[PDB]
Amino acid sequence: ECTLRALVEEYNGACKEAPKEMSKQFTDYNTFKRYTTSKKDHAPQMRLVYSVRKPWPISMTPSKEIPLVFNGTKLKDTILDLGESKRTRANIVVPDYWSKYGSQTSLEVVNAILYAEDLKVQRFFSTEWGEIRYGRMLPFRKPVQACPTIEEVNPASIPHTLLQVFCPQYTTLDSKRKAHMGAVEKLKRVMEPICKVQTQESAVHIARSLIDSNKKWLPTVVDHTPRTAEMAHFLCSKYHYVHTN
């Protein structure tokens, strides 16, 4: 396979160009995965308007599918971005150009990246709402599971359950025990199209979304089921309550 050859070449290049960073500790990955000089979470609201209007306002990794000039408009720069090794700048309309003239993925990948959201939308659009009744309702807060999950799993065994979904060959027998066998095959069958080494940084997030139960304080009148809690913002209030069936 050429993938192994590419991995070996990338390892050799990283060894050559960064001798010191390769002499670090593997446990330091938890701290240099975030090593950047950028300050983008520092008051981002107050810079948006003139940042998307600045020349070369967007960050876009070099590729051959984006022409330099399309219909007289320069879409991308020929200079790698500052502080970036595999990332350069482009024009703000590059997303718009890609939305029509870009490459296409498979129909199965779309149903995988949009799985949890699709279940949320179908859950919302498969309920016969009752009639709104008005009154001096008393909403009280109580820790309730936010959104429905595919299967009930202890929050302490979620990492050990996802490890059997993505990398079952890189785990011990203890993690094999402390995993919810029953939630691993469903996640595998719904995430196989994106279990590749390119969408594995996005599949873990959504797969965790299907399986993680986060207790959150939500207003209620009657006790929430886990399905009537993601929609509590409009089913209950201090003046109205609609009774779902």
Binding site: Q25, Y134, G135
Partner: protein, 620 residues
Amino acid sequence: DRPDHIDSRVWELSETQEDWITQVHGHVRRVVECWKYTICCLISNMHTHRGAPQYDVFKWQDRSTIEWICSKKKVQYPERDTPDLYDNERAVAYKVLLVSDLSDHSPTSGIYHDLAFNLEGEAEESCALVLRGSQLQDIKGFLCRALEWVVSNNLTQEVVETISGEAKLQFSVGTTFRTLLKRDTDWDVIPTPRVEPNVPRIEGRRWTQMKKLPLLKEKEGPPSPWRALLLGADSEYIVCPPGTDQEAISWIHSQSEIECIRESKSTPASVITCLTSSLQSFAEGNPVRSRIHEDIIAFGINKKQEKKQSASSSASGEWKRAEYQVEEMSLPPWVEEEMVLLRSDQEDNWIELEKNAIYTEVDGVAEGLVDKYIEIVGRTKVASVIEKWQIAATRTFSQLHTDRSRITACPIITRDPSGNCQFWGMVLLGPHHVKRDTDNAPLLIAEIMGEDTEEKYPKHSVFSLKVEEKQFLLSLKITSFSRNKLYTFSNIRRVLIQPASIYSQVVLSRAAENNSLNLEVNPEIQLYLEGAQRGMTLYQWVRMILCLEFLMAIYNNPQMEGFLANMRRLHMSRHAMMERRQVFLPFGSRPEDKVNECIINNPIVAYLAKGWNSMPNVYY
């Protein structure tokens, strides 16, 4: 620091297997683990079975490769009791257990058959049977070297302690760091004060009841001039023929005459040429023009250098500390008339917000309340001023390249439902290189006026504008405005939310008590107007609320923030007294002193303070 018998390779491999430094006798434990790993290596020195080596070292190896090997060998081991090495010629896994007794066989685990040595070199009889002699002599030599190193350093108690039990966590503060620590405290690291724990009885003070609400200080001085960026209620538009911005500006520039009715020394009358040049350039098509000689005065080009040079030229001889005075000002008369004209009914809705989707009966109810609220507060002058402020701020902050060296024109043009353009004015962004949030971008705002005062607009320069047998007054002020304020005024339409919340609460509470929504409730609400109690309809009230919130927003400053923050306590105390409740205060309690320290010159703060000092102060 490495022992001589311990190889460099095993030492480097051991360096990070366990956290030696925070363990009791960590170096000794590292040396013992190196002994065990070296013993395991000597057991598997070039000895092979079939085609692969007879023993596979499972100690100090990556866990994933160990799992791979175990899968090849059809075995599985727990991580916290994993074997040390595996023998493929006898299908058993082994572990090194250097011990002292050599008599306590005591099989540690039934998963791996354990190998124990007496630390003198001899092997427990089972291990002696199950291993070949050359390995035994190799371990004999390695251990005699280990113990000569031990006796050379007097570590026998440490090594027996390590081979006895597991590691113990610890933390160590050195003698030198302790002395540095104790330089500024009378106690040591672990405080042991020689006093008997008790709670003393101290005599305090009495708590006084607030019989009457505090009276805020009405400050005295010259009335506060209007200091907002735009003109507020005294702002009008010119109904231009329908078209685009360029066509409207061309019409305005061609069909106009400019004459000075009132010139202020703050903004000279020679900066009108800048506005005319900008209008001509924007009409020609290019919204950005070069610099003219009148721009140096209208935008403060090289102002810093000339002021610095003048300050250097004229200087005192003491170098005293810097004292800054904030001039005291009284409530100007224009606040009430501003609040009145901002409530004037208009002909069209000035709040045009795209509706959201509707999917549920709840959704339609939510969009009915908002629709009715926009119907209430959209056909009102305050809505017009909010709209003009939003277009002005957005067109100045979006054209704020934030790094530019030429003058940019940003007309304030809106469209009526009939399509006719409405020219409210034009902001002129000048040479700006703002980086810090305190930096000010030069501005030159031309605005259509409704009435000149000379008491409310002292710095503005009023001009007469003649467009098609109609008379308009054009103000022209030189201002500097910061990026943060341009940002927060581009989202000025958020001021419509606080007035909306009050209306929403009233309507929804009436629906809750009536068990049904109406959407056409016009309740009477009692307020202390002109000092007396009168009942008003909540459609004028939300309008008053909206105008007051708009005036507060455009006049927000540290004085307003402090006044509002320290005044909520007094408002809550009034609410408590209205319910026939008693309010008590601590000894040195003067809650009005934190409100009175923020009343300096802000006109809206003075208006609110006067409104408070027109209310009942005792609730019998």
